[PDB]
Write an enzyme that holds these catalytic residues in place. Structure first.
Site: not given
Ligand SMILES: [Zn+2]
Length: 356
Positions: A30, A32-35, A37, A52, A155
Site C-alpha cells: 500500500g 499514499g501521499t505519506f510514502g 508500505v 513503511k 483518522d
C-alpha cells in the site's frame, strides 16, 4: 524531494552484515501521499515484517516521528496488542539510493484493510455478526487511546483498520473470528495537556461537524468517525459522500433529522480582533448560516438543483437499518450525535447492549 523508488528484491536499511539491506523488499502493501508500505523479509530475524517508507518531506517526516512516539508507548503497555493497535517493531532512517533520507517504521506483517475487504466484496453490506466483532475490537483500541493514553487518533476510517493475516482466509473472506489492527498514528495527537484543538483533521467523509464548525474538537471526534465507519460496514457504502462543507453539514442534518435534538447549530461569533485559528474557522463556518439556520439549500448559490437531489437520496438513519438490527441502530445513535458533548466514551459504548 519525492517518494522512495524500489524494485522487488532490493534491500532497505543497510547494516554491517547486510550492506544491501536488512529488510528485503518482497511485495507492495500500500501507499499514499505519506510514502509507501512494502512487505519485507527481515534477514536478521527471518520473519515477515512490514516496512513503511515515508516520503522525504518534513510535513510527512514530522508526522512519521509523531507516529513513532505514539507506537513506542502503545507497544510498551500493550506488547501483544491486546487492544488491537498496530505493533511497531523497529524504526530506522533509510538514506535513499538517490540522496533523500527516509524515516521508515517496521511493523508486524500486515493483512488487507477493512476498505479492501469491502471493495473486494463489491461494497456489499458486511454481515452484522462480523460487523459486531470488528466494532468491538475497534472500540477496544479507541478506549486504549482515549482513556488509557489520552491520545486522539483523528483518522478512524476503514483504510486504517487492517485484518491480521491469520484471521484472513485464502478464500479472501473474513469470519466473525477476524482480528483487526488500528493503524496510522501519524495524525494522532496527545490531549493530556491541551485537550481542545481547532485544526482541520480527519478525512472528509469521516470528519465530525465540530471540526467543520470550529467549536473545538477532542476525543469525541473519533467516536463520530467510528459511527460513520459502522454505518459504512452495514450498508457497504460511504455515508457522507460530499466535499463541500455546507452540503456535508446538510447530509448530517438529513440523516439525523428524526433523532430529536440533533440539528446543526452555528458556532459562537468569533472576535473580529482575533487572528486565532479558532476564529478563522468559526469565521468561515458562520458564512454557511443565515440567522441561526444552516444556509441550505439557498447557500449553494444549476448546482442548488444537484445538491437538492443528492441530499434527497441521503437516507434517514432509522431507514438504513433493518427491524431486527434495532440494537445496532441504538449503538450508532450514541456515536453520530452532532453535539460532540453527547457522544459516549468508547468505554461506555463497549458496555452497550449491542455487544452482549
Ligand atoms: Zn437493544
Amino acid at each position: 524531494e519525492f517518494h522512495v523508488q524500489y524494485s522487488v528484491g532490493e534491500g532497505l536499511g543497510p547494516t554491517a552484515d547486510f550492506p544491501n539491506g536488512r529488510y528485503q523488499i518482497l511485495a507492495p502493501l500500500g501507499s499514499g501521499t505519506f510514502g509507501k508500505v512494502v512487505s519485507c523479509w527481515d534477514r536478521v530475524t527471518e520473519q515477515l515484517v512490514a516496512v513503511k517508507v515515508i516520503r522525504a518531506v518534513r510535513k510527512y517526516a514530522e508526522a512519521a516521528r509523531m507516529e513513532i512516539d505514539i507506537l513506542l508507548e502503545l507497544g510498551r503497555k500493550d506488547p501483544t496488542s491486546r487492544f488491537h493497535c498496530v505493533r511497531m517493531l523497529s524504526y530506522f532512517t533509510h538514506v535513499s539510493q538517490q540522496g533523500n533520507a527516509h524515516v521508515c517504521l517496521v511493523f508486524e506483517h500486515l493483512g488487507p484493510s477493512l476498505f479492501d475487504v469491502l471493495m473486494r466484496n463489491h461494497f456489499r453490506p458486511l454481515p452484522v455478526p462480523i460487523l459486531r466483532a470488528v466494532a468491538r475490537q475497534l472500540l477496544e483500541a479507541i478506549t486504549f487511546l482515549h482513556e488509557h493514553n489520552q491520545i486522539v487518533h483523528t483518522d478512524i476510517k476503514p483504510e486504517n483498520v487492517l485484518i491480521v493475516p491469520s484471521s484472513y482466509y485464502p478464500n479472501r473472506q473474513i469470519t466473525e473470528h477476524v482480528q483487526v489492527r488500528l493503524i496510522d498514528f501519524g495524525s494522532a495527537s496527545r490531549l493530556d495537556k491541551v485537550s481542545v484543538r481547532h485544526a482541520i483533521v480527519s478525512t472528509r467523509h469521516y470528519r465530525a461537524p465540530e471540526i467543520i464548525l470550529g467549536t473545538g474538537w477532542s476525543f469525541a471526534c473519533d467516536i463520530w468517525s467510528f459511527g460513520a465507519l459502522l454505518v459504512e460496514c452495514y450498508t457497504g457504502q460511504t455515508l457522507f459522500q460530499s466535499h463541500d462543507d455546507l452540503e456535508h453539514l446538510q447530509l448530517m442534518q438529513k440523516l439525523l433529522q428524526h433523532e430529536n435534538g440533533e440539528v446543526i447549530v452555528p458556532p459562537p461569533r468569533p472576535s473580529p480582533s482575533s487572528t486565532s485559528m479558532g476564529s478563522q474557522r468559526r469565521r468561515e463556518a458562520l458564512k454557511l448560516f443565515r440567522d441561526g439556520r444552516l444556509n441550505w439549500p439557498e447557500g449553494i448559490d444549476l448546482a442548488r438543483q444537484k445538491s437538492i437531489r443528492r441530499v434527497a437520496r441521503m437516507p434517514e438513519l432509522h431507514s438504513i437499518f433493518r427491524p431486527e438490527h434495532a440494537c445496532l441502530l441504538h449503538l450508532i445513535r450514541c456515536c453520530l450525535t452532532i453535539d460532540p458533548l453527547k457522544r459516549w466514551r468508547p468505554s461506555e459504548l463497549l458496555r452497550h447492549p449491542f455487544f452482549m
